[PDB]
Amino acid sequence: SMGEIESYCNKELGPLPTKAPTLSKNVLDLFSLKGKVASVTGSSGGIGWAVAEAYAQAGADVAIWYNSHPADEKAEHLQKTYGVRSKAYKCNISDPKSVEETISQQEKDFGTIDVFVANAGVPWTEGPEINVDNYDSWNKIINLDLNGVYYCAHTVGKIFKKNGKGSLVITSSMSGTIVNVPQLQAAYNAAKAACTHLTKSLAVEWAPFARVNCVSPGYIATFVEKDMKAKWWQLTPLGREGLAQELVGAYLYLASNASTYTTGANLAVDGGYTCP
Amino acid sequence: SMGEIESYCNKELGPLPTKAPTLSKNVLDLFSLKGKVASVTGSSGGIGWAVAEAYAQAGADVAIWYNSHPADEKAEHLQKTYGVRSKAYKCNISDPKSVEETISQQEKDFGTIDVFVANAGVPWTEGPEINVDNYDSWNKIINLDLNGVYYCAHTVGKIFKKNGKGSLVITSSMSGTIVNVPQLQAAYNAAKAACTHLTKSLAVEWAPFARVNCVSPGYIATFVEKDMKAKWWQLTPLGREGLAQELVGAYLYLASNASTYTTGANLAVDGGYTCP
Amino acid sequence: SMGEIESYCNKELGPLPTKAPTLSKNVLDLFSLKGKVASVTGSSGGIGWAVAEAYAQAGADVAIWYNSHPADEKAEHLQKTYGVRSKAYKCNISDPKSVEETISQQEKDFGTIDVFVANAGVPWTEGPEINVDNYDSWNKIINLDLNGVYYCAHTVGKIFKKNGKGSLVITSSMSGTIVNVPQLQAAYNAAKAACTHLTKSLAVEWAPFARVNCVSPGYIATFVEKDMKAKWWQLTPLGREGLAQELVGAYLYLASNASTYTTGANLAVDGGYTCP
Amino acid sequence: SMGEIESYCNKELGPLPTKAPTLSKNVLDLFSLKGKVASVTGSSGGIGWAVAEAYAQAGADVAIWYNSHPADEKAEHLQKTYGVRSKAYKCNISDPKSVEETISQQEKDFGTIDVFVANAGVPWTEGPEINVDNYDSWNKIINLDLNGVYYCAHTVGKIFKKNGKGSLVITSSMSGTIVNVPQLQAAYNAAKAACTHLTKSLAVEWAPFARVNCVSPGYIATFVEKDMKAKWWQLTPLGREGLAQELVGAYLYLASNASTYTTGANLAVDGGYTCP
Ligand SMILES: NC(=O)c1ccc[n+]([C@@H]2O[C@H](COP(=O)([O-])OP(=O)(O)OC[C@H]3O[C@@H](n4cnc5c(N)ncnc54)[C@H](OP(=O)(O)O)[C@@H]3O)[C@@H](O)[C@H]2O)c1
Ligand SMILES: NC(=O)c1ccc[n+]([C@@H]2O[C@H](COP(=O)([O-])OP(=O)(O)OC[C@H]3O[C@@H](n4cnc5c(N)ncnc54)[C@H](OP(=O)(O)O)[C@@H]3O)[C@@H](O)[C@H]2O)c1
Ligand SMILES: NC(=O)c1ccc[n+]([C@@H]2O[C@H](COP(=O)([O-])OP(=O)(O)OC[C@H]3O[C@@H](n4cnc5c(N)ncnc54)[C@H](OP(=O)(O)O)[C@@H]3O)[C@@H](O)[C@H]2O)c1
Ligand SMILES: NC(=O)c1ccc[n+]([C@@H]2O[C@H](COP(=O)([O-])OP(=O)(O)OC[C@H]3O[C@@H](n4cnc5c(N)ncnc54)[C@H](OP(=O)(O)O)[C@@H]3O)[C@@H](O)[C@H]2O)c1
C-alpha cells in the first residue's frame, strides 16, 4: 500500500491518478460510434428504436431486442440503410436466465459489446395503488423495470470488465425524480428512482472499466384521455410532449467518447417538467 | 365539477382548498402521541426499539414487530414503564400475506393504527455486485427493503383511509441519496432510493387521509472493520457515527401533530454525510 | 499527524472520532430550550414571530428583530407570558455593519446566543425578469435574502466557535428547490437556492462547534389574486396553504437537542408541493 | 381564453400544445452549429476556450470574451483555422453596464446571437469563511459568479425573445450540488447553487423563446498542492481530474438541436464526484 495513493471509492482503480483517455481534437469525432457494438433493449418500442437507429447512423453495430413484437425487419433496415451489422433477439427480460443467454449470444455474434442501453420497461396503468387489492401489478413493474434492468447490467458488466471498457446507459424517467399527476403510479415511480440510483451505484462500482449514466425522459409522444394530457401540457415549461427524436442526442452523448468524464449522471430530457 | 376547484394532484381531496387542522397553541403539545396507536416494524433492532420507546414516552400505544429475536419483554417493558398498551408480533415482512395478517391483528388488538413506521430491513454485505454469480442476495434485499416496505404501506394505508387520518414514516437511508464507499452495496442503495421516492409517491396518493414521510439515517452505532469505519468518520462532517437516540426526534416530529404540513419529505439525519 | 485519524472534511474536528453529545433518555426533554438564548431575525413578520413564540414556549430567551415594524410589544409579550428574557432590536440586515452591531449587542444583553434563525427576507413581486429593465430589484433580493443571511451567519458563527456550541437555522423556501408558477420570481428562487447550499457549506465548515440546517416552507397563509392561489392549491398535494403554526415543530426540532446528528439538512414543510 | 388550454407555467406560450421543432432525421446533423452565432464568456480561460473552439469546429461564429488576458489571437485562430467569423471583446462582467454594451456590440457585429455560454467566473481561495474579517471576497464571488451571470442572461435573453429562439448554457459547478473538501469555499458553493437554480428559473420564464441549461464540471485540469489533489482523486469515482476536452461534448449537446426538449437541466460532468 505504501507508495500508492489508493482510492476511497474503489481500490480496483489502482494507483491514483488514473490515466486520461486519448480523445480526438475535433468535437464532432467524439460522437462517432464507428467500430463499436451497441445493444439496445426494448428496441422494438418507440424510444428504443429511435436510439438504435441513431446509434447506427453514428456507425455502430446494433443488437435489437424485442419481446412480443418481432423486430427482424428493423435490424435488416439498419443493415441495409447504414451498412452496419444488426440482428434482433427475442427475450423476456424479467427472466434472468434468458437475459444471460441473450447477451452471451450477442457477444458471440458481434464479438463484443461496447455500448449497452437498458431501455425496456412497462408502465403502471391502474391508478391509485390503494384500490389494487393484490400485488401482481406491483411485482410486474419491479421485476422488469428494476430487476430486469439489473439483470442486463450485471450481465453486460462482466463483458465490460473483461475488455476494460464500456458504456451503460439506463432509461430512467422523470418519474424517478418527481411524482406524476394526475395519473398515479407509485410502483413505476419507485422502480425508476431505483434505476436512477442504481446508475450512480454502478458508476462507482464499475469505474475501473466502464461508465454508467441514465436518461430521464419526460412525456414522449407516441389513446389517452385528452383532458389528462392537457394538464401535462399545462405543467410542462416547453408546453408540449417530446418526440423520440429529441432523445437521441442524449443517448449518443452518453454512449460515445463525447462523455468520457461523465459517469453516474442523470440527463433530464423532459421539457423542463421537473423544474416547477 | 362546475363551481369547484379540483386538484391536479388527487381529486379525492374534494373541493379546494382543504381545511387546515386544529392545532395546539403550545409547540410542546404538538409532539404528543397521547391517545394514538403506533406500529413500528423492526423494533427488536436498534433503531426500531429506540423509536418505539420514544413513541411510548410520548404517550402512544406501541405494537412491536420482530422476526428472529422475540421482543415480548420489550413490550412488557413499555407497558410496565410508561403505562401504555404494547404487544410484540412475529412476522416475516417479505411475505405479503403475513404482513396483512399481522396488521389486521394489530387493528383488532389496539382498535386502530394512527402511526406506522416501516423500519425493518437488512443490509447488503457481499461487496461488489460484479463478483456475485446469482441474484439471491439482490432479491433478498429488494423483497424486504422495498417490496416488504410497500406491503406494509399498502396494508396500513387502507386503515388510514377508512379513519381519514394517519402518519406513515418509512426508514430510508442516506444510501438512497448517495453511494456508500468503500463498502459497495448497489442493491441496498437502489432499494433505499426506491423507498425515498415511494414516500413521495404515496404522499401524493394518500393526501386526502394521511401524511407520508421518510427518515434517511447515516451511519448509526447499532462489528465491522476498523480502517473502514475510519474512512466513514473522515467523510462525515460531524466526525463520528450517530446514536439511535439522535434519530428519535425526527421520528417523533413526523409521527405527531408537529408536522401536519410536512408530507413527502425526506429528513436526513446523517451527520452531514450527504453534503461533501 | 501520525497516530491520529484526521478528517477529510475539516481537520479542526481533531482526532477522529469525535465524542457523541450527552442526551436525555426521554425524547420530550430533547426538545427543551430551557437555559438557551435564541435570536430570530424577521420576527416581526408572520413566520418569525411564530418561531419566536414557540422557542419561548420551549423555555428560550428570545431576541426579536424588526426593521420597519417595531416589535417591542412582542418581546414584552414573551417576557410576561412565559417568564423568559426578551428584547427587540432594530436592524436593516442588508447593512453588514448594522448586523454586526446588533448581534454584538445581543451577546452583551443576553450573555450568549445558542440558537440563531436567519429568517428575515423579502419577495420578488415584479413578474418576469425579462421586462424589468434595471437591476435594483434583483440586487435588493440578493442583498437581503442571500448576503444578509450570510452577514448574520458569519457574525453569529464567531460566537458559536468561541463557546464551542450552537445551532443555526436558515429560512430557505421551496423556491430554492423548485420554480414557482405562475408568478415568476427567478431572483428569489436563486437567492433561496444559494441559502439552501450555504446551509450545507456552513454545516461542513462549522462542524467542530455548531450545526447548520434550513427549513424550506411552501405557501404559508397570511390580497393576492384568487385565481393564482387556486392554481397553488391545485398543485399542492395537501390541497391548501400552510399555517405558520405548522412550521414551528421543524424549527424547534432543528434548534434543540432533538437533532444533534442533523446538520446540513433541508427540511421541506410544503404540503408536498415539491413532489409533483 | 375560452377555447384555449393555457399554461400554468407561462401563458406567453400561447394556446397549448406548442409546436414541435423540425429536426434532421440524422443524429449527427443535430449537433451542427452551422449558420449560428455563439458568444462564450471567459473564453480566454481553459474551459471557455475549449468550448469556443469546439463551437467553431461545429460551424458557429464565435464571439470571444476576455478581461485581463487579451484573446484576439484566439479569435484570429478560429477565423483562420475554421473559416468562421470571430472577434474578442474586453469586458468586466461584474459591471452590468459593460455587459450590456458588449452584447449589444456583438449583436451589431455578428447580426444576432443564437447560443450564449455564461462561463466567466473566479474561485474562492481563502479557506474557511469564519477567519475572513470582511466581506470583500464574498462580494467579489457573488458579483461575478452570480450577478454577472445574471447580467449576461438578462441581456442576451432580450435578443432571444426578439428572434424567438436561443440556447443559454450556464457554467455552474459540482460545487452547486456538493460541498468541496478539504478546501472550504462556502461563497463559491452558494453562488454556483444559485446558478444551477437560476438555470431552472429562467428555463421556465424563457420557454416561449429559448432553452436554458447548465453544465456542472467537477475538477478540471486547468498549481495547487499535492496532498490536497490526492484527496480529490481518492473521492472521485473515475480516479482522476477531468480534461477541458471532456466538457465540450456537453456544451455542444446543449447548444445545438441535439437537445431541443432539454431545458432547465443540470448536466454533471464530474467523474462521478457527486455520487459518493
Ligand atoms: N413518455 C414515455 O414514453 C416515457 C417516458 C419516460 C421513460 N420511459 C421509459 O422508456 C423506455 C421505453 O419505453 P417506450 O416509451 O418506448 O414505450 P414502448 O413503445 O411500449 O416500448 C416498450 C419496450 O419495452 C419492451 N418490453 C416490454 N415488456 C418486456 C419484457 N418482459 N421483456 C423484454 N422487453 C419488454 C417492449 O418489447 P415488445 O413491444 O416487443 O413486447 C418494447 O420494446 C421505458 O423504460 C419507459 O419506462 C418512457
Ligand atoms: N447505520 C444504520 O444502522 C442504518 C442507516 C440507515 C438506514 N438503516 C435502516 O434501519 C433499519 C434497520 O434498523 P437497524 O439499523 O437498527 O438494524 P438491526 O438492529 O439489525 O434491526 C433490523 C430489524 O429488521 C428486522 N428484520 C430483519 N429481517 C426481517 C424480516 N424478514 N421480516 C421482518 N423483520 C425483519 C429485524 O428483526 P429480528 O432481529 O427480530 O430478526 C430487526 O428488528 C433498516 O431499514 C436499515 O436499512 C440503518
Ligand atoms: N409563503 C411564505 O410566506 C414563505 C414561504 C417560504 C419562505 N418564506 C420566507 O420566510 C421568511 C419570513 O417571511 P414571512 O412569510 O413571515 O413574510 P413577512 O411577514 O413579510 O416577514 C418579513 C420579515 O422580514 C423583515 N425584513 C424585511 N426587510 C428587512 C430588512 N432589510 N432588514 C431586516 N429585516 C427585514 C421584516 O421586518 P419588518 O416587517 O419589521 O420591516 C419581517 O420581519 C422569509 O425568508 C421568506 O422568504 C416565506
Ligand atoms: N475545476 C474547474 O476548473 C471548474 C470546475 C467547475 C466550474 N468551473 C467554472 O468554469 C468557469 C471558469 O473556467 P476555468 O476553470 O477554465 O478558469 P480560468 O482558466 O481561470 O478562466 C476564467 C475565465 O473567467 C474570466 N474572468 C475572470 N474574471 C472576470 C471578470 N471580472 N469579468 C469577465 N471575465 C472574467 C477570465 O478572463 P481573463 O483571464 O482574461 O481575466 C477567464 O477567461 C467558471 O465558471 C468556473 O467556476 C471550473
From TrEMBL, chains A, B, C, D:
Superkingdom: Eukaryota
The answer on whether this UniProt entry bears the keyword Membrane reads no
Instruction: Report the record's Gene Ontology biological process terms.
Output: carbohydrate metabolic process; small molecule metabolic process
Q: Which GO terms describe its molecular function?
A: mannitol 2-dehydrogenase (NADP+) activity; oxidoreductase activity, acting on NAD(P)H, oxygen as acceptor
Q: Which InterPro entries match?
A: NAD(P)-bd_dom_sf (IPR036291), SDR_fam (IPR002347)
UniProt keyword annotations, A-Z: NADP, Oxidoreductase
By sequence similarity, the record places it as follows: Belongs to the short-chain dehydrogenases/reductases (SDR) family.
Q: Report the protein name in the record.
A: (S)-specific carbonyl reductase
